[PDB]
Each structure stands twice: as structure tokens, then as C-alpha cells.
Write a protein that binds this ligand. Sequence first.
Ligand SMILES: Nc1nc2c(c(=O)[nH]1)N[C@H]1C(S)=C(S)[C@@H](COP(=O)(O)OP(=O)(O)OC[C@H]3O[C@@H](n4cnc5c(=O)[nH]c(N)nc54)[C@H](O)[C@@H]3O)O[C@H]1N2
Ligand SMILES: Nc1nc2c(c(=O)[nH]1)N[C@H]1C(S)=C(S)[C@@H](COP(=O)(O)OP(=O)(O)OC[C@H]3O[C@@H](n4cnc5c(=O)[nH]c(N)nc54)[C@H](O)[C@@H]3O)O[C@H]1N2
Ligand code: SF4
Ligand code: SF4
Ligand code: SF4
Ligand code: SF4
Ligand SMILES: [S]
Ligand SMILES: [W+6]
Lengths: 214, 957
Amino acid sequence: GKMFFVDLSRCTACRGCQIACKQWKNLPAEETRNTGSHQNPPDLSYVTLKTVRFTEKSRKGPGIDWLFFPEQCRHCVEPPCKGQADVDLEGAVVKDETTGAVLFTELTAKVDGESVRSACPYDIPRIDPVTKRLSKCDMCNDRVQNGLLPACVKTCPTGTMNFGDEQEMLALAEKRLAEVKKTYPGAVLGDPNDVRVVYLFTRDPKDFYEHAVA
Amino acid sequence: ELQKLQWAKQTTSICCYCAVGCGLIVHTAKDGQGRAVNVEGDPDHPINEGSLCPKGASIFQLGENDQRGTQPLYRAPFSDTWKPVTWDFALTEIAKRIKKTRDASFTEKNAAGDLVNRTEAIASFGSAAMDNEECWAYGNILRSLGLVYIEHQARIXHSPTVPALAESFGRGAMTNHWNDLANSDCILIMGSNAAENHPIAFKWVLRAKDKGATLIHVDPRFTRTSARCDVYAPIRSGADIPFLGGLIKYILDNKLYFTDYVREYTNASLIVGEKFSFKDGLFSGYDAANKKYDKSMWAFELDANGVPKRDPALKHPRCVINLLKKHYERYNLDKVAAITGTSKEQLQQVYKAYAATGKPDKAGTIMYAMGWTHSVGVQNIRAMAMIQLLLGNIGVAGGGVNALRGESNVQGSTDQGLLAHIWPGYNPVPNSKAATLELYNAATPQSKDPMSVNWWQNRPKYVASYLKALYPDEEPAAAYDYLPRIDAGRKLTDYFWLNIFEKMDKGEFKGLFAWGMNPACGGANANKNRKAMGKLEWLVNVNLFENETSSFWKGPGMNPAEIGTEVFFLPCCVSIEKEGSVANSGRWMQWRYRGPKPYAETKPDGDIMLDMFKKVRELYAKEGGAYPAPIAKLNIADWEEHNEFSPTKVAKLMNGYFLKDTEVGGKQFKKGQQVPSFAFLTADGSTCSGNWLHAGSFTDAGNLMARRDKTQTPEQARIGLFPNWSFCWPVNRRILYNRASVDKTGKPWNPAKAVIEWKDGKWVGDVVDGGGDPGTKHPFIMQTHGFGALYGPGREEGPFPEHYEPLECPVSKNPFSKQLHNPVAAVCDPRYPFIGTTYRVTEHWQTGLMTRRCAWLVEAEPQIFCEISKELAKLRGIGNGDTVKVSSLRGALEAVAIVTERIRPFKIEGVDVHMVGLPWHYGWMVPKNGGDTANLLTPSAGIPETKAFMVDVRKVW
Ligand SMILES: Nc1nc2c(c(=O)[nH]1)N[C@H]1C(S)=C(S)[C@@H](COP(=O)(O)OP(=O)(O)OC[C@H]3O[C@@H](n4cnc5c(=O)[nH]c(N)nc54)[C@H](O)[C@@H]3O)O[C@H]1N2
Ligand SMILES: Nc1nc2c(c(=O)[nH]1)N[C@H]1C(S)=C(S)[C@@H](COP(=O)(O)OP(=O)(O)OC[C@H]3O[C@@H](n4cnc5c(=O)[nH]c(N)nc54)[C@H](O)[C@@H]3O)O[C@H]1N2
Ligand code: SF4
Ligand code: SF4
Ligand code: SF4
Ligand code: SF4
Ligand SMILES: [S]
Ligand SMILES: [W+6]
């Protein structure tokens, strides 16, 4: 299988990943407005598969801890969204055995879109108010199958986004956590046994986003 | 196979935004016959390695955009709407307006009776966005027509940077390059928001950290850069010179300077004349009435030969180093802390971290871009250069003054002399007193020092070779009379950006070229400028989309019916729809190729400007008119292939070729051969070259700018020179002043990060910056005396940076002298008590003309905002996300309030002073509810003031 290692201690919130996702899939842009934040779009939706979340936490002395979270589907090893979806219709949510990608097919119109989002402990799935189909990050399975990096991984300049085989990524995450701890001593890996998107957080994952971990 | 990319032709490009120069791969439908289907990063490109920030990442949405211009548009005097017209009509009518204005205003001889052969009735703005070949051709077209008011983007950064670094090092350019940031042991980012404004640069900043480096951000605001640094140090706006002055004193007090480097390679040892002194914030030779200095009073004491006297013992009290120590004694931590608002603890921390790079086997780099670099902005950068010379960080891997250029080709556009004071290759524009070519060449200072290379002594070869590229059938001395001259008697700054807007408002301009710029948003005091454009008879706008400049006449508060300005809007093609080169901040001149054909009836800038000129030439050939010679004889046949502008042919003319069989440097050269280096150019007319800096870029071996070869020696690969990827001027010297990186033996100071090394009779690694055996030449070959200048007696404000207060309104006290404000230099209306500042975000570009048309970037940053502290929010009863009115003496606008701890009140003379932050990326044109330019608020009072202007911020209910 394949795995994303996301080192958030290197993220500059450039949002190259956010734009690159929409470029590769030719997705449309939402109607957005500024409500007192750089964060936009404010949430994932049918047409936004990745958004960078901004969070400001007060620290002692000058400046802040500015916490950046490029949110995507975790592509869980044991997908709860599949388990729930398979109660309505088996096929709607399938698992690629090559890559480990959790993929929503066109049969997600048939299943209960509401409850399959509830089952997701990361609150990832989003419903089309029209076709009633579920959309999210598909791990750019298209590109991964063809021995290319996902768009968000390739576009990232900082070395935040890393992609490859589960073994060599977990090996990287452990070695990187060791060096990052010297700068951010409260650094941790998010659910490194349950998912294929392993986020390195500089501090309490709940500070980055409510559904940052299970 | 990936279906989206299957069947599409794959070509390479370079990003059309910032000066990092990120590689793209473009996929073009129908094997190159149709539209672009995909644009993403070039994985083989050694700067970005496939990475793109959201601007580069969104270039597909820029190019394949149905809001883009399709054909020329015309607007008749007082017309309420655009009238779509053909190219033939637009260029023809444009060519007639030029001739009408030229003939009517062309002055052969100024009042004083001196030859000038110029027009002062036509001005041109732009552009750093055009290809290098297009910038060169444009400059020459404008100069053949006799224009002197020729400016672009570069002015805002040039005026501070180039004179600061030229004075210090002998060249004005970024000393190192992006990949080299990775070799640095301490990175000081100060007057830069690189994480947002040069994003791919942070690939190499973070890799510097991985290998042990400390990253320091010095900024009044906490940014996305600050979040990824080891040390965030807040600084009060305009307290930079105090801060750097404290660092100089810290380095000298604690003996942290690189002694051998300083004694040999800087001017530390040179004896300043007895006439030099400093007292009460004034240097010697001050004229109180005129408010300027007699710089002869700052001269060096010359020996019998005429060479500045030196004490290698550094004992003489008039040694530069000893006068430096004296001058900066006053910048103690207590005074610097009080004025900067930086804690003594953090100052000591930052000072200790960075001055540790004075170690011969450690390298420190300073990164600055625009920041706030006003009256003493030149002296700010001088202090950075002086710190780097003290620590011996100039010429070494991970060192240098990395003065980050803004636009993709602002380096190239400057190199092609699209500023009023310079021809291509930084040969000055002649003034009225420079009556002959011999007199022009007489102005170059000479050195009697045999160790001093003084390379600028070759200038006559470059000027002659230049005039032979434009006018190859004439003698250089004869051709010299064709090109216009500025008034020797007038201030140089009267020909610059800010006075072009002043003159325009006084209706002293008939015509303006707005070529790849948006003045109506870019210019400070937008209300004034938008009204001033109404006083033009004709305006030529060449851009990708309809914009605030093209359509100023139907702008906010405007009435088309009573605006008589005749506008031609010519739609140019995007970067991926044409071939050519762009020169990045690191001087990497990078060849890119056509993907899709020009969208609709759009044209490359080369074809627009060349076709426009040919129609002007045609009119003069049939009608005659004012002094036709320069227009008639200009060699545009070398610019053209298959009835079209040839990027390839212009690039070969810019590199240059021998016009006859010539013997140079004791080597035979055949006629028609490409000149292989500027070393082999001549003054006798044997050679031509559009730009001597390009001599070496396109040789008989081919187009070196189009090299995509990642081949590196171990010592090259250790510091990421990539000398076989594209070509950088001068002659592929990737790190400038690299002779300073080795002792008089030729051994590196830092063998683990060698730039050059003397091995077996040759320099190995980078190309040596100046030929000659180890210890036989002074390392700064473009300097007259050959030394890194700690003492700079050519600067208007004095030979040492001194704190003079740039932030007028809230400051009354200078703790360093009697002299509050700059002695060679605002209303402060109490109704506007806050410091307005303007800056960028990652997702938008310049005035936003380009990025406001890209839906994915509008998605991320849809509206103008006003960032304010929690303290100012509490004072003015503003909540996060509330609509506010920001106002000044110049205008007012509405924006969304972002309340953030990233902004903190300045503490100035026992008072809380609140700073108000606005993005200048917005304009009335597009999008809906996006907002208008923050330059509605900025004052006019030759560079505009955009970082500190007075505002009020009120909540709107
Ligand atoms: N995303 C993006 N990138 C760009 C551009 C763009 O529009 N958008 N434009 C390009 C251009 S033309 C240029 S010139 C460069 C400019 O690049 P930068 O110079 O990085 O641009 P700014 O964000 O205007 O200013 C940088 C920082 O200076 C800080 N600053 C303000 N006043 C002071 C002061 O008195 N002292 C110090 N030390 N810092 C101060 C601001 O808070 C800001 O964080 O960016 C280029 N790249
Ligand atoms: N308040 C405030 N004002 C500022 C600044 C600030 O920080 N604050 N920054 C100042 C600085 S540093 C600068 S450099 C200026 C920049 O100001 P401008 O240069 O006037 O701004 P833009 O026009 O947005 O710059 C990019 C332009 O290049 C055009 N372009 C792109 N590709 C091409 C091409 O191939 N051909 C042609 N012909 N045009 C092309 C784009 O369409 C766009 O119009 O703004 C200055 N103004
Ligand atoms: S993160 Fe949610 S949507 Fe994605 S695979 Fe896991 S359960 Fe399914
Ligand atoms: S992996 Fe692909 S689909 Fe998922 S967020 Fe990244 S670019 Fe978008
Ligand atoms: S591209 Fe990389 S650095 Fe930029 S926001 Fe995405 S993850 Fe962060
Ligand atoms: S905008 Fe600058 S940093 Fe971003 S992709 Fe383009 S060249 Fe690279
Ligand atoms: S620029
Ligand atoms: W700029």
C-alpha cells in the first residue's frame, strides 16, 4: 500500500496543495467571502476536496503559534465509511488493493449520504445537494497507479507533503518526529496505525482542527 | 497512461510570477495544435523540483481564461464604451499618434544649446513581465523614437538596492542564488516575507535548518514566514538602521568579525582624509541652505601614485575600520531596544546567533525584498552589506546579501535598461554635457593599483558594441548622436516613476505607454493618478485582460462623456503562449518554449512592439518628419524571422557576434561567429552586442540559457551551483565575489562548502569572479579600488549608515544625534492617527490584475481586508470580520476587519501607536465585492511611500 506523511512543522500555508488539487481535477471555485480570516474555502464541500485550515494560539512573548492544517481524507486502513455505506449498497465505496485508496464510486447517490459522513471519525465526506453523490480526496489514485506523486504532494515546496510505500513513510515519520521534537518538543504523529494520511502535529492535534485525530 | 496528458504535446516553461524562476511542464492538446489541458511543476527543475506555490499552480486558469482580451479595443475621446477593431487599424492609428506627438515636441537641442535629440511629450511604464528579448527590443524602440521617460516596476527596489550594493560590492544584483540558501548556518529574513512572497525559497531555507541553521524573522507583523522561523523578533516600522547599527557595534565590541577577510578584502585598511568628520548627526561638508553634502570632504588620503593609502596593521586612527568602530559606539543595546521595541534579550539572542557566522567555516545570509527600503533605504541595505563584509559572508556558500527581486524578469528588464538613467548593461544614458562618445567614456574612474581589476574600464567596448548592434553600418561615435540624452542640469529623479505621475497631473504628457503595468492601481494616490490619466490625449495599454488602467475613464466617480483620452487596449498572450528568456533573482537566464498558440487574436509583446515600430518607420519614410535618422537606420531585420519577432535571433544579437575577422585576447575569431564572452568585445567596431552581460549566453556552442543539464562535480553538487542548468550573467558566475571565499593561496575559508578552489593551476567549482592567480588581484573587480566598501563615500546621506527617522508623525526623539530626520531630504493630520501599511499575501500578484481573474486564487482571498491588533479592535469597537472604513487625506475605502495577535501596538516615546495592515491586490474592475486598491489611501510625496502612511479606521454599521 501507499501512505502520505504530512510534516506540519514545515508548512508555510502557501496553499499550493489547495490550488493544485483543483487544477489536476479541473474542479470549480466556490463563492467565498472574507469573514475575518485568510482561511477560504472555510470548509470542505462537494467541489473542495482539500482546504488549508488556519488557527492562531496565543504564546508567551512576541508572535503566536500559527497552526496550519491542509485537510484531506485519511484513506483509513479499515474504512468506517465503507462499513456504513455497505449497509445500503456494496460498491458505492471500494478499497483499491494496489495503493490502499478509499474511493467513492458513482453508486454513492444510492446510499444514505448523511449517515456515511457521521460514520467517518474525521468528518471528511461531503454530499452534492443535486446528484446526492459523495466526494472527497481520492489520493489522486489516477496518478499514483501511473507511478506519479499526487498533485498536492508534488506541488508542496516545504517538504510537508511526502508520499510512497507505507513502510518507508512510517520509517520517515519516526526519523522526522525525532528531529522535529528538538524544535517542537510536544510533536506527535496522528493515528499512525489506523490511516494512510499520517499528520505530524507540532503540538495537541485538537489545536490544529477538532477532527485532526479519531 | 494518464488520459488528461495522453495525446497532448509536453513542453517546458518558467513561472510568469515571482523572481524564484520555478520550472513548469505544459501539456498542449492535439500534439501542440490546440489549447493547454494541464500546467504543473517541472520535477527535473533544480530550484522548485516540481513544487509550485498557488500562483504558479494556477497558471492553467490564467491562460485558459474566457475573461482574457481577444482582439484590440479602441475608445474614442469622450466615448462611453469600447469599439472592437483590427490590429491593422490599432497599430496604424497608434503609429500616427506617436509621429504626430514626436514631430510636434521633438527638441534637437535643449535651452543650453546642447544636442539631446529627444521627446518629453511621451512617457512609457513597463515591464518586468515581458521576455528578456522583448524588454531589450522595447527599450531600443522607445529610445529610437527619442523617449527619456522610460520606467517600470524595478524603480521601487532599484533606487535603494542597486546604489547600496554597487557602492558596497561594485554590482547591484543578488550576490548568491536560491539553492545556495541551503548552505547557510544562520538566515536573517528582514524586510522580506519570503514564505508568502518567494514561497519556493523556503524549500531551501528549511533545508538550511535541517543541516543546523537558525532562521530569524525581523518583522513588525507575525506572518506565515514567522511561523516557520526559530526566532520571531518584532521591530517598529523604520527602526532597521538602529537594529543593524546595534549588530555592527556588537560584532566590533565582541571581536566577532572575520579579521583576515576584513584586512585583505574590505576597505578597512584604507586611510580616510583629515577633512572627514561626524558630529550631532551631520558628516563634514554639509551645505545647510541646499541640504546636501560636499562628498570631496569624505575622500581617501591618496599615496604618490593616486591609490588610496592603506595601513594593513589597522592601527592608524583614520583607517575605515577605526572610524567605523568610533561611528557605531552610540548603538548600545539599551538605545536600540528602546527605539526598535525589541527586548534586550531577543536583540542579544539574534546578535549572538548571526555574528557567530563571522567564523571562517560558518556562513550567514540576509534576505530582504521590498520591506521598507524611504530617504535612508539605501543606507539600510548599506548596513546589511557592511555586516556581511565584517563577518566575511560575501562570496561564500550560504552567505551574501540576497536582495530578492520581485517579478519573474525584473532583473532582465533592468538589465535591458527600461529605467530612465541606464541603457542595457548598466551603461548610463548620456546627459546633455556628454557631447561625444569619447567624453561619455571619459567619466569611467581609473585605478593606478595593479591588483585592482577595475573591470568597468572595458565600458568603451560595451558602449561601441551596443551602438553596432542598433546601427551596424555606422561608426559608434556617429551612432552615439541618434540616441536621446537627459538634461545634465536637472535632477536625475525628474525622469523617474513618481515625477512621471506629477508631470502627467500637470498635463505635460500627450502620450503614455502602459505596457504590462496597471498604474491606476500600482501608483500611490490612485485618485490623483486616475484623474491625471484624463489629461492625456492618448494612452496605449498592452495587457492580458481589460483593467483599471485601460478602463480608468469609466472608473469609480468618473464620467466618460467629459474625459477626452483616446485609449488603445492591445491584448498580449500569456507566458506559456510564447518562446524567450526570463532572468530570475539569481541572474539565471532561463529559456522557455511555446505550449498553446496565442489565445484568440492575442500577440506576443515582441510582435506588437515590432509591428507598431514598422508602421511608425513607414510613415516617416513617406511623410518625413522630425529627425528621422534614428528610426530609419535601427537594425530590426536582426530581430525578425519568417515575418515574425524572433526571440532566438534577438538573443543572439544580445549575446553579440563579430562583424569582421578579428584577433582578440590573442585568439583568432572568424566573421559572423557569436562572441563567446564580454572579455572578447572591442571598441573599434569589430564586434556587436545588445547587452555585454549576455555575451556568453548564446555562443557558437548554442543557447546556454536552454541547457537543462543537472551534471555537477562533487564540490559543485555540495553547494548546488548547477552550472550546466541554463546560464547566469556574468559568464555563469553563480556566486558573485567568490574570490573572497578563498585565502591568498586559493584555499577555501570553508572547505566543506567551497565555491572555488585553486587546484593544479586552475580555479575549480564555480566560474571565478575575476581571472588571475590566487592573491594577485583584489576580489571586488567591479569596484574602482577593488575592495568591499565598509566606508561608502558615494552615498548622498554619508559614507556610513546613520539612523534618521523615516516614521515622521509619531516620533519626535532621535536617541543617536541632534538630527531627527534625514539632513539631505508629511502633514500628520490628527484625524488620521494610525500607521497604514500595505503588503502582499501568497495567493495574489501585484495589483491583482492577473490573480483577481483566477477563480481559485479569489476563492482563497476573495476580498480586501484590514488586519488590526486586539488592542485597536477594543479601542475602536471592531469585531473579527466586521466591515470597516479606512481613510486618509488622499481617499477612503471599505474592507473586512481581521483582528489578530499577529499585529501588536508599537511603543513609541511612552505611547501605544497602532499599525493598520492592507493588501494592495484589489481593484474596482474585478471581482464583485473584491474592493478597490489600497493606493486610494497612499500619498504621492523618486519612489512612492506605501509601508508607512497615516490612516483612520472606523467600524461601518
Ligand atoms: N505573493 C506575492 N509575491 C510577490 C509579489 C506579490 O504581489 N505577491 N510581488 C513581488 C514584488 S513586485 C516584490 S518587490 C516582492 C516584495 O517582497 P516583500 O518585500 O516580502 O513584500 P512585502 O510583503 O510588501 O514586505 C515584506 C515584509 O516587510 C515587512 N515590513 C514592513 N515595514 C517594515 C519595516 O519598517 N522594517 C522591516 N524590517 N520590515 C518591514 C512587512 O510587514 C512584510 O511582512 O514580492 C514579490 N513577490
Ligand atoms: N500600496 C502599494 N503599492 C505598490 C506596492 C506595494 O507594496 N504597496 N508595490 C510596488 C511594487 S514593488 C511594484 S513592482 C509595483 C507593481 O505594479 P504593476 O506592475 O503596475 O502591477 P501589475 O500590473 O499587477 O503587474 C503585473 C502586470 O504584468 C502583466 N503581464 C503579465 N504577463 C505579461 C506579458 O507577457 N506581457 C505584458 N505586456 N504584460 C504582462 C499583467 O497582466 C499585469 O498587468 O507596484 C507598486 N505599488
Ligand atoms: S477519513 Fe472518513 S471518508 Fe476518508 S476513508 Fe476514513 S472514514 Fe472514509
Ligand atoms: S491527494 Fe490528490 S485528490 Fe487528494 S487532496 Fe491531494 S491533490 Fe487533491
Ligand atoms: S503546499 Fe505544502 S507548505 Fe503549502 S500549504 Fe500545502 S502542505 Fe503547506
Ligand atoms: S510564484 Fe514564485 S515561488 Fe510561486 S511557483 Fe511562481 S516562481 Fe515559484
Ligand atoms: S518588482
Ligand atoms: W516590486
